[PDB]
Design a protein around this ligand. Sequence first.
Ligand SMILES: CCCCCCCCO[C@@H]1O[C@H](CO)[C@@H](O)[C@H](O)[C@H]1O
Ligand SMILES: CCCCCCCCO[C@@H]1O[C@H](CO)[C@@H](O)[C@H](O)[C@H]1O
Ligand SMILES: CCCCCCCCO[C@@H]1O[C@H](CO)[C@@H](O)[C@H](O)[C@H]1O
Ligand SMILES: CCCCCCCCO[C@@H]1O[C@H](CO)[C@@H](O)[C@H](O)[C@H]1O
Ligand SMILES: CCCCCCCCO[C@@H]1O[C@H](CO)[C@@H](O)[C@H](O)[C@H]1O
Ligand SMILES: CCCCCCCCO[C@@H]1O[C@H](CO)[C@@H](O)[C@H](O)[C@H]1O
Ligand SMILES: CCCCCCCCO[C@@H]1O[C@H](CO)[C@@H](O)[C@H](O)[C@H]1O
Ligand SMILES: CCCCCCCCO[C@@H]1O[C@H](CO)[C@@H](O)[C@H](O)[C@H]1O
Ligand SMILES: CCCCCCCCO[C@@H]1O[C@H](CO)[C@@H](O)[C@H](O)[C@H]1O
Ligand SMILES: CCCCCCCCO[C@@H]1O[C@H](CO)[C@@H](O)[C@H](O)[C@H]1O
Ligand SMILES: CCCCCCCCO[C@@H]1O[C@H](CO)[C@@H](O)[C@H](O)[C@H]1O
Ligand SMILES: CCCCCCCCO[C@@H]1O[C@H](CO)[C@@H](O)[C@H](O)[C@H]1O
Lengths: 308, 308, 308
Amino acid sequence: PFPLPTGYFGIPLGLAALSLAWFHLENLFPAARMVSDVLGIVASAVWILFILMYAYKLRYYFEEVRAEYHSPVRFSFIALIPITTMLVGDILYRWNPLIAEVLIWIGTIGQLLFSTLRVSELWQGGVFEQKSTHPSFYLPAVAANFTSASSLALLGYHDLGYLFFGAGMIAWIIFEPVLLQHLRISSLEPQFRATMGIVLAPAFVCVSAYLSINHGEVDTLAKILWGYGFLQLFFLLRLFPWIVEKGLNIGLWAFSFGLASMANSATAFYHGNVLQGVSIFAFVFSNVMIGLLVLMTIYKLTKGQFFL
Amino acid sequence: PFPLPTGYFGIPLGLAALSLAWFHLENLFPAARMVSDVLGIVASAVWILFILMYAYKLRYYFEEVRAEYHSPVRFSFIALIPITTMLVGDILYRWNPLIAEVLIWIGTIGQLLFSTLRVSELWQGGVFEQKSTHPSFYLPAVAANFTSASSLALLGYHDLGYLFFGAGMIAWIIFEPVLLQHLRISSLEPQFRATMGIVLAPAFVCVSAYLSINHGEVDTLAKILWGYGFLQLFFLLRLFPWIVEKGLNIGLWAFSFGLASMANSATAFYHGNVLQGVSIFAFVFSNVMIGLLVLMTIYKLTKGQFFL
Amino acid sequence: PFPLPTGYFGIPLGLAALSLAWFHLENLFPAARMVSDVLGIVASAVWILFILMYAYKLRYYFEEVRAEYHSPVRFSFIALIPITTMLVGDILYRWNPLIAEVLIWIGTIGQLLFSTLRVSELWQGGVFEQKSTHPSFYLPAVAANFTSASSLALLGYHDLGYLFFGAGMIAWIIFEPVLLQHLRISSLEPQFRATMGIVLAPAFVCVSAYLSINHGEVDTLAKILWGYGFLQLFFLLRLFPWIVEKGLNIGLWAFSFGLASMANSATAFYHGNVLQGVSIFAFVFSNVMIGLLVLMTIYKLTKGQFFL
Ligand SMILES: CCCCCCCCO[C@@H]1O[C@H](CO)[C@@H](O)[C@H](O)[C@H]1O
Ligand SMILES: CCCCCCCCO[C@@H]1O[C@H](CO)[C@@H](O)[C@H](O)[C@H]1O
Ligand SMILES: CCCCCCCCO[C@@H]1O[C@H](CO)[C@@H](O)[C@H](O)[C@H]1O
Ligand SMILES: CCCCCCCCO[C@@H]1O[C@H](CO)[C@@H](O)[C@H](O)[C@H]1O
Ligand SMILES: CCCCCCCCO[C@@H]1O[C@H](CO)[C@@H](O)[C@H](O)[C@H]1O
Ligand SMILES: CCCCCCCCO[C@@H]1O[C@H](CO)[C@@H](O)[C@H](O)[C@H]1O
Ligand SMILES: CCCCCCCCO[C@@H]1O[C@H](CO)[C@@H](O)[C@H](O)[C@H]1O
Ligand SMILES: CCCCCCCCO[C@@H]1O[C@H](CO)[C@@H](O)[C@H](O)[C@H]1O
Ligand SMILES: CCCCCCCCO[C@@H]1O[C@H](CO)[C@@H](O)[C@H](O)[C@H]1O
Ligand SMILES: CCCCCCCCO[C@@H]1O[C@H](CO)[C@@H](O)[C@H](O)[C@H]1O
Ligand SMILES: CCCCCCCCO[C@@H]1O[C@H](CO)[C@@H](O)[C@H](O)[C@H]1O
Ligand SMILES: CCCCCCCCO[C@@H]1O[C@H](CO)[C@@H](O)[C@H](O)[C@H]1O
């Protein structure tokens, strides 16, 4: 027995999001559906296993859960649980809309309850410190709201989706200023640097949610978001040797949320006949990168260097 | 004789804004007009009294005014004077557009002069400190501009209204990041905690001004603003026991600006047939809360625990 | 021989931008074209001279260039080189679209490479300090992207222009919060205060780029940007005696980017029949101010107080 590290939910997250990106190519290239189904089944299977492992953690390692919950830094990773639950719901919708809808509401209510309890509590002061200003905060504060937005849109609740979308978008703009100033002043320590991959996520996760609500209309807002997203991509590419100064590691799955959302949004740009060449590049690049993450993870597993 | 504490202008502010919310229901439910008129008359009467009291302060307690003006924290409350003057103008417009227009211009010129003189002066450095980063700064920097926007729209100056609207909206987005980071790191002391109610205001005051200019069109921007507004509401509800740790007090009128603007915007959502159930909830909730503020204020008055 | 101070590129920048503002009045008042051509030729001639001077710096004073590049503050001024190169391209487009397009791509690729190499590197921490939080950072992070946006639109690449536009707009919103908080807390030293003129630039440079892409449609976003732009103008006017506490100096060319972009955007507002009176005022004001900068620069030159 061992306690599952919460960040491992980023693996089914990235795979699930990538499944959904391929799903959105099925009417352009029908073979995309099989790719989407295989990614979706793998993501769902991994999610089930990790949910079971985390249920075991809650039962037998509760003080570890309590400590991560109350941490002004580590609490954020818990949001991966409802995020992934909603993404698995989106996948399952293609086969069973009833079960999908249950998962989507559990993850939406769960993430909103979680932020309401913990993100707000930080405003009491004295626990969060300047050094707590980490990319992981995007998970409960931003990514969870975007994922509710797009999942609720899938279910037909577009106006409710816009409320979640706005909560995420404005929360993003209100957090990022202080994050980037912190990174400029304070060198993030190597053990946390893989989480720089979360910095890729906001603009791409935002535009993918936006396009899912707005019926895939590639408008001025969508193009604006893509532009900042690519700026951040270029910055993180330049930063990559520094990010991995102390070696490649499984934490690099942090990049997969933004990469998969870049792929998803590319499908909508392509469908809309906007920047189709960029779209192709983006879709291929993100798939190659996630493919590399998969190969490195299989390798770690075959060495027995995966679970703590 | 006594010097009137400037924050007491939040009382006619909240009542005036709530009058205007009811006004906007009159064609759906005609009895709303009487409710609006009674709220409006009470707000206007209280405003007249407080303006007279503040004129007395200026004449006989000028050094107290000077000290609050030059304070990098306390100066903000002075913006309540022009804000309330414009809101009373909006109320009076239903009876006398000439007098209303005079009040609206006095409050617009007054607030813009005030910010131009004081908000900019802070950028000289060395007076404002990290500890000066309080919710009250929203008053001169954000709320005053939104109130000019909607008042100018009432008078038919929609494009000028958009200039004020943009000044407020961008000023909001540019201040809030550093406010929330400050609250996370530094516990706000109990004596200032009621001012956390001002954190409710931006998104709701923003959307209410937006809808007043844009002829009540409930569009993507409006829905985005409502979503972040509700996020902040939920956070402040969770925080409420901490806010009132040292007891209930008259400072809780700080919440009334955001509550009344939530009510006002709800009327527009309802008229637009967007999220009508949410709209009803919001309108009823804000009225109940402001009603409780009124009952607690009457009680303080009947104990002689109102004026210093 | 002497090493050219990099900030002097602000002179051809301001003149070039002002040339383009006049260009956009030619169909309303045909004599505007001659004014535009004279400004454009002067700006281009000064640019050629300064590029040659900087090429000499690179050849014979390389360690000075290296030190400014690696400085977390001084690196920003280098972005003036590609910015001005693109603006000269926009001017030359009226006579030779082929040469113009070459300059526009050199400046676009150059600025994007520059930011990708240096702006991102700051996120490694430990070099940039709180005291490095200067208005000049807008140059690589914001202004360069807006200038690419509008230049690419000139060439017909509107959707690519929107990507650059979004990169600039979101980068602006994400930097300004921490800049203004820094200015409030820390008094900027006199020797840097002229750079407060760069604070005028974002909203005006943003709206001018937006209007250049969107085919001159003066919409809600444009009006919002103008409103915040004018707020900042009023604040900087109030601050001007403090800015020039230690005397008038050539650094005041910092204001010319925002002033010229206010003029440019005014032409579009005027064409769109939005706030035409404000438009006239803005256009005349910015021209008078830049005219004063020119007269003061001629005077410095005639005293031999221009080049180091
Ligand atoms: C994803 C699930 C995370 C849940 C973490 C909940 C942490 C609650 O935390 C604990 O709850 C205890 C009661 O059991 C209280 O006695 C403790 O004071 C409190 O710290
Ligand atoms: C992801 C699903 C939501 C997790 C809900 C766990 C409920 C947390 O519970 C509460 O959080 C508070 C801290 O904010 C503590 O004061 C309480 O002791 C704790 O029980
Ligand atoms: C954080 C940055 C927010 C940018 C918001 C851009 C506003 C969207 O821009 C609007 O989009 C519409 C559809 O494309 C256009 O028709 C409008 O004219 C345009 O202003
Ligand atoms: C998100 C982008 C993924 C879409 C992959 C598109 C690859 C198809 O390639 C495109 O096929 C078209 C016909 O179908 C041709 O007209 C184009 O020239 C070709 O580039
Ligand atoms: C709402 C009204 C607030 C006005 C406060 C103005 C504060 C001006 O302040 C004082 O003005 C004096 C002249 O009377 C000067 O001698 C002082 O230096 C200056 O501090
Ligand atoms: C709400 C109506 C606007 C109030 C106008 C009061 C004018 C303030 O006046 C000035 O403010 C400056 C500080 O910025 C001081 O330098 C001056 O001494 C003071 O007179
Ligand atoms: C701080 C966040 C700003 C969000 C801006 C949202 C841009 C408004 O969004 C625009 O609104 C129009 C009317 O609903 C739509 O038709 C446009 O397509 C949509 O982008
Ligand atoms: C801002 C929201 C305030 C509006 C209050 C609406 C309360 C009216 O209630 C509504 O009345 C309708 C007919 O008028 C019915 O069709 C609806 O079922 C009912 O909910
Ligand atoms: C506008 C042009 C600015 C270019 C500045 C480049 C600064 C590069 O800097 C230097 O490059 C040297 C190689 O020449 C290396 O040996 C040094 O380590 C590096 O500091
Ligand atoms: C304005 C045109 C772009 C200038 C390109 C100069 C290339 C800078 O070059 C590199 O920058 C790095 C710092 O980020 C250093 O590590 C390298 O030593 C240096 O060569
Ligand atoms: C940082 C602030 C961003 C503000 C974004 C405003 C969104 C643009 O606003 C949109 O513009 C369209 C064209 O005018 C309108 O038709 C839309 O209804 C309006 O929401
Ligand atoms: C950017 C603003 C620059 C445009 C300068 C406009 C000055 C023209 O002036 C305008 O001329 C019109 C006829 O042409 C008249 O109808 C108007 O009354 C007059 O104000």
